[PDB]
């Protein structure tokens, strides 16, 4: 009874910016843990690996008001520095939505033109009929079929041609889009025009950035809320799972190794600072060639590529060390080592390669502890 509509402030230390503190509405929950909204994690920079958070309870009416208006979570969806949306679908929601919007060639139920005695037959009457066709094994979400839409809004330019008098409040129309792109456009508000694109975290940032400017804040809060439900729902169905089989090794490395190692072995005849640089500059190309050949080898449906290619998480350089070769690793000083890491984490690293790998790995981890200390000292001088 007293908890009702009584806001509380959540804090995750360290607090770098003002979004490190946000107001929420409490929901009595069992257990001793705290349930945090997955979208606000980017603001708190809060990992679920065991982070601890603090709660404060405002008392006076002025304090409660400042928590509801100023510090409410739904009120601040944008980073007050760059302006980009800070709370947006990320990680599972990215790959979850990136999976829906994609259109697969020759999927089940794909629409084809009418030929001779066969009518079109690929189109569907209504979106509700597409669900009936989906539940039964006929329709696929990634199919190329086209449907007739009533409530949804068509793109602006295409809207004016279909309708000269106005928009489509209750009026029907048709376009060719994947069902995943139709269901995705159902989450967005009705007034927003159709997208018909495959969702990338960069594109999804362009759309959310467009809603924050054009529409009210509440509509953006509910739209982002509806996006995380679909992002999580289709993240399980995404078919994205890691196994030793999905990760694979490109063959071209051994040739580049044969080429480089042997053509660099011919360089060993001449053998000083440029000699190692000649091997480093040579070995620098071997890593690029393996990664380039690796990108060409991997199919698109494989999960590891779908990740980091949709912007959810990861980078190509990290995948360059996983398969292929991790490449040269720096020594205690800033000097590179000519001898590379020819092995990959998939193939396993030799005893010796591991010893020289910790040289750079620990030095970078010690840098992390130092940079956070100097940045905190710099920030206090800026504030004061």
């Amino acid at each position: 009874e007293v908890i009702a509509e009584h806001p509380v402030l959540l804090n995750r230390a360290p607090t770098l910016h003002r979004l490190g503190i946000q107001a929420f509405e409490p929901q009595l929950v069992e257990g001793k843990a705290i349930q945090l909204h997955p979208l606000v994690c980017e603001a708190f920079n809060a990992d679920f690996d065991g982070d601890q958070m603090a709660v404060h309870l405002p008392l006076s009416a002025e304090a409660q008001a400042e928590a509801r208006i100023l510090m409410l979570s739904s009120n601040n969806i944008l980073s007050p520095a760059s302006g980009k949306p800070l709370a947006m679908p990320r990680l599972d929601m990215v790959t979850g939505l990136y999976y829906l919007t994609t259109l697969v060639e020759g999927a089940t139920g794909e629409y084809q033109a009418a030929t001779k005695d066969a009518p079109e037959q690929g189109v569907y009457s209504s979106p509700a009929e597409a669900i009936m066709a989906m539940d039964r094994g006929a329709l696929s979400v990634r199919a190329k079929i086209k449907v007739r839409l009533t409530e949804l809004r068509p793109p602006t330019d295409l809207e004016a041609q279909l309708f000269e008098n106005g928009w489509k409040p209750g009026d029907a129309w048709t376009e060719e889009t994947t069902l995943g792109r139709v269901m995705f456009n159902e989450l967005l508000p009705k007034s927003y025009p159709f997208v018909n694109e495959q969702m990338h975290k960069k594109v999804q940032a362009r759309i959310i950035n467009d809603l924050a400017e054009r529409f009210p804040m509440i509509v953006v809060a509910q739209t982002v809320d509806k996006l995380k439900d679909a992002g999580f729902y289709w993240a399980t169905r995404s078919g994205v799972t890691v196994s030793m089989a999905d990760v694979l090794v490109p063959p071209q490395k051994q040739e580049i190794l044969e080429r480089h190692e042997a053509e660099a072995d011919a360089i060993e005849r001449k053998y000083h600072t440029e000699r190692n640089e000649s091997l480093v500059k040579i070995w620098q190309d071997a890593t690029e060639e393996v990664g380039k050949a690796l990108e060409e080898f991997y199919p698109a449906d494989n999960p590891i590529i779908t990740i980091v290619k949709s912007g959810a998480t990861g980078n190509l350089t990290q995948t360059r060390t996983l398969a292929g070769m991790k490449g040269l690793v720096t020594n205690p000083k800033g000097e590179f080592i000519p001898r590379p890491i020819k092995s990959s984490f998939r193939e396993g690293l030799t005893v010796l390669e591991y010893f020289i790998n910790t040289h750079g790995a620990r030095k970078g981890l010690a840098d992390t502890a130092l940079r956070t200390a100097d940045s905190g000292y710099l920030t206090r001088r800026l504030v004061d």
Binding site: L16, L78, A81, S82, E213, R371, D374, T379
Partner: protein, 34 residues
């Protein structure tokens, strides 16, 4: 003179204290510098 409030997307309110906001805007990413 300041400009549009980056979080609001609108003009800056009469109460906004932008010195602390700017200090945090510059300091927070400082962990990514080399």
């Amino acid at each position: 003179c300041y400009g549009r409030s980056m979080a609001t997307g609108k003009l800056v309110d009469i109460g906004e204290a932008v010195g602390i906001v700017a200090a945090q805007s510059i300091g927070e990413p400082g962990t990514q510098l080399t």
